């Protein structure tokens, strides 16, 4: 009569590494590293992302004519740019503090596009029909949907001074532009004053802009330049524009809401009818595992990104079916 | 292993023991068979469950983390942001891989120890009423029916009850 003591063996082929030995076949184990995604852009906690289509942030904010106009009000969980964004700034020039603006938009959860300065009503005694071929649409020369190219009317550019009081109860993103002709002849033909200036003030913002005329290499067949500026007008505060030339005036502005967990990602994937708690530029992750090796860029509640190819914890025994 | 049982003086595992990590095989007149030890298996399961869960718990939820952009005159800040992201990534990859290796080693050792401890528990229960025939087995110096076997398995083996007969067979 005999009794023996022994231990479990099974057919498992799971292998784990240890410090003394690599590649040990074990009976039971758990994988801690998520490596699978669904290859789709999804809703994040039930909220769809903001897709900019053919535009980047600049093109969308300035109102580039080539992109399909969005609904007046939007709410999102994250912002998606496409890698090949052909439509951005269409009239050549510098976008001052553009990166900072993107970083601001990274915590915005909603916008309302509203007419801050109505076209036929805000700039009397000035022309508002200025267009350009650098910002073409359907072949014809056009211009930014959110801005207005003010020029001389009937041989004169009278000093304008207009203002907006923010009664939206939220921050209002106001954008404008400053035009820089390549010569003084064009400066006179457009704004009738060689010593022009633009002034923009709020309670906490205070800037003055002066035309700087010089011949420049052609960009998008333009020797002139256009510098783009922006400011966030606090609730209740007032913004004042004052100019006698060169002002690319605001026409539409954005009432902004703040949120958490958002961000801006560059992605190729397509939006699908699906929901997730974790979104990467390559696809969504549905997992409770502590690590992932899919992508460093994550939105929502995601596992920690690591470079590892394998993170497998043994739970069972050294497997010896022999 | 560290305690010398698994892949040690007990060469291999039992494909035929399907209801636990550690256990017994017996052979007597009534027949033979496998029966796992549920107390030790349950203890080991509790331990390793708590280990796995501990590893998962120590890693917090990774909330939103996306890249930033910098203009052509902000190269230093761009490289500093990059140095930060790469540093943190190095450190976490290192931490994860190392923790998994260490804990794997300790887990195999833990199993080895459980098997050895079970063996020793049985040995100390049986004393000289049986002999160690190697490979983790005991040969009784007396008849051990199903009831006797079960008394051994659930830790209530009655040594004096078989002491005489064993002494006689041992001679």
């Amino acid at each position: 009569d005999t009794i023996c003591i022994g231990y479990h063996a099974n057919n498992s082929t799971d292998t784990v590494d240890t410090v003394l030995e690599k590649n040990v076949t074990v009976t039971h184990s758990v994988n801690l590293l998520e490596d699978s995604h669904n290859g789709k852009l999804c809703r994040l906690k039930g909220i769809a992302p903001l897709q900019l289509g053919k535009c980047n942030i600049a093109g969308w904010l300035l109102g580039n004519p080539e992109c399909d106009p969005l609904l007046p009000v939007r709410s999102w969980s994250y912002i998606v740019e496409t890698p090949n964004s052909e439509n951005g700034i269409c009239y050549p020039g510098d976008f001052i503090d553009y990166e900072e603006l993107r970083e601001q938009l990274s915590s915005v959860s909603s916008f309302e596009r509203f007419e801050i300065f109505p076209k036929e009503s805000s700039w009397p005694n000035h022309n508002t029909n200025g267009v350009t071929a650098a910002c073409s649409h359907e072949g014809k020369s056009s211009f930014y949907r959110n801005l207005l190219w003010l020029t001389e009317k009937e041989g004169s550019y009278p000093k304008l001074k207009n203002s907006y009081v923010n009664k939206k109860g939220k921050e209002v993103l106001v954008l404008w532009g400053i035009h820089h002709p390549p010569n003084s002849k064009e400066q006179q033909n457009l704004y009738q004053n060689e010593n022009a200036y633009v002034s923009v003030v709020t309670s906490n913002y205070n800037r003055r802009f002066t035309p700087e005329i010089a011949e420049r290499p052609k960009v998008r067949d333009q020797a002139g330049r256009m510098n783009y500026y922006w400011t966030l007008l606090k609730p209740g505060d007032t913004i004042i524009f004052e100019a006698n030339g060169n002002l690319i005036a605001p026409m539409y502005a954005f009432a902004l809401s703040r949120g958490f967990g958002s961000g801006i990602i560059t992605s190729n994937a397509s939006m699908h009818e699906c929901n997730t708690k974790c979104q990467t530029p390559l696809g969504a992750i549905n997992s409770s595992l502590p690590y992932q090796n899919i992508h460093p860029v994550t939105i929502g509640e995601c596992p920690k990104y690591v470079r590892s190819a394998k993170l497998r914890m043994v739970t069972g025994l050294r497997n010896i079916p022999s | 292993g560290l305690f010398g049982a698994i892949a040690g003086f007990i060469e291999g595992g039992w494909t035929g023991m399907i209801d636990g990590w550690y256990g017994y095989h017996h052979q007597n007149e009534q027949g033979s068979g496998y029966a796992a030890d549920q107390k030790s298996t349950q203890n080991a399961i509790n331990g390793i469950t708590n280990k796995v869960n501990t590893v998962i718990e120590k890693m917090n939820i990774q909330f939103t983390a996306v890249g930033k952009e910098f203009n052509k005159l902000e190269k230093r800040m761009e490289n500093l942001n990059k140095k930060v992201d790469d540093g943190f990534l190095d450190i976490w990859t290192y931490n994860a891989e190392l923790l998994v290796l260490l804990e794997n080693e300790r887990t195999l050792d833990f199993h080895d120890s459980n098997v050895k401890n079970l063996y020793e528990k049985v040995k100390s229960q049986l004393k000289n009423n049986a002999k160690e025939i190697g490979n983790g087995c005991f040969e009784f110096y007396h008849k051990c029916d199903n009831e006797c076997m079960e008394s051994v398995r659930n830790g209530t083996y009655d040594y004096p009850k078989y002491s005489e007969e064993s002494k006689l067979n041992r001679e």
Partner: peptide, 11 residues
């Protein structure tokens, strides 16, 4: 989490 390896386990 649980390691449901045997049905008699307590989990």
């Amino acid at each position: 989490x649980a390691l449901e390896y045997f049905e008699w386990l307590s989990x």
